[PDB]
Amino acid sequence: HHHMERKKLIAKFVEIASEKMGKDLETVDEENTFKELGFDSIDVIDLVMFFEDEFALRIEDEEISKIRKVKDLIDIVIKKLEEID
């Protein structure tokens, strides 16, 4: 059992936003849209490429374009990590 997987990926999202992207989010809810967090389409691409590199994943362009909510990115990452297993 890999406990706390969502908490951990939200925490990674917050750290990357802060450290790589200069965005202080502090208290993230998974249900927030990226749009409401102030991430535009280009920011989502940068965020995805940062997760890709951190986790040695590949996320297809079609999947990136469908990302709306934080939850969507957390879900994709878990799914890609589960596969690479």
Which labels suit this protein?
monomer, 85 residues, Non-ribosomal Peptide Synthetase Peptidyl Carrier Protein, Chain A, globular
Structure description:
It is built from four helices and no strands. It is mainly α. It has one domain (1-85): Orthogonal Bundle (Non-ribosomal Peptide Synthetase Peptidyl Carrier Protein, Chain A). Helix 1 (5-19) crosses helix 4 (70-83). The longest helix has 15 residues, at 5-19. The protein is globular. The two termini are 14 Å apart. Belongs to the acyl carrier protein (ACP) family.
Principal-axis shape equals globular
CATH topology: Non-ribosomal Peptide Synthetase Peptidyl Carrier Protein, Chain A
The CATH homologous superfamily: ACP-like
Radius of gyration: 12 Å
Multimerization state: monomer
Main location: cytoplasm
Subcellular location: Cytoplasm
Function: Carrier of the growing fatty acid chain in fatty acid biosynthesis.
Modified residues (O-(pantetheine 4'-phosphoryl)serine): 41
Topology (SSEs and partners):
Blueprint: H1 5-19, H2 41-55, H3 61-64, H4 70-83
Subcellular location: Cytoplasm
InterPro entries: ACP, ACP-like_sf, PP-bd_ACP, Ppantetheine_attach_site
Keywords: Cytoplasm, Fatty acid biosynthesis, Fatty acid metabolism, Lipid biosynthesis, Lipid metabolism, Phosphopantetheine, Phosphoprotein
